[PDB]
Amino acid sequence: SLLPVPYTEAASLSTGSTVTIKGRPLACFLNAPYLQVDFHTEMKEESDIVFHFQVCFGRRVVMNSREYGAWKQQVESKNMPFQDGQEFELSISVLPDKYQVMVNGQSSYTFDHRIKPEAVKMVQVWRDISLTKFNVSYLKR
């Protein structure tokens, strides 16, 4: 849609930051489109990932971190609030202990911090979606 995918924005995160993403899958759920959101430690795409969030629409969600080039312990969820053929609103909040992921206003996943959120320098949103809105909030000290 409006914003190009893969979408990359330089970013900083701390407690109280919220990342808001509005978009739509590019395929029906029968065809298993993916969505991936990665919080990176540098602008380079090969950099470490403090928070990796990957939706296989209609099947599962996997969350992980990539630290000094290597993937760590995967967290796999079968929770699937996303609806076939529908626009979604994703809200990722930085709490003191974890990221909290809201889908269409409903708490749907959390992921405890493995690396301090202050290590993030970039957010990338990619795979099989179009994007109409992306925002990182910067309202708190």
Residue closer to its own copies (CB basis): 34 or 119: 34
Residue 57, both tokens: 């629409």
Give the nearest distance from C-beta 95 to its own copies in angstroms. 27
Nearer to its own copies among residue 73 and residue 139 (C-beta): 73
Choice between 74 and 106, CB closer to its own copies: 74
Q: Shortest approach of its own copies to residue 6 CB, angstroms?
A: 6
Using CB under 8 A, list all residues that contact its own copies.
Answer: 6, 26-28, 30-31, 34, 38, 45-46, 69, 126-128
Cβ neighbors of 31 (< 8 A, separation 6 or more) are none
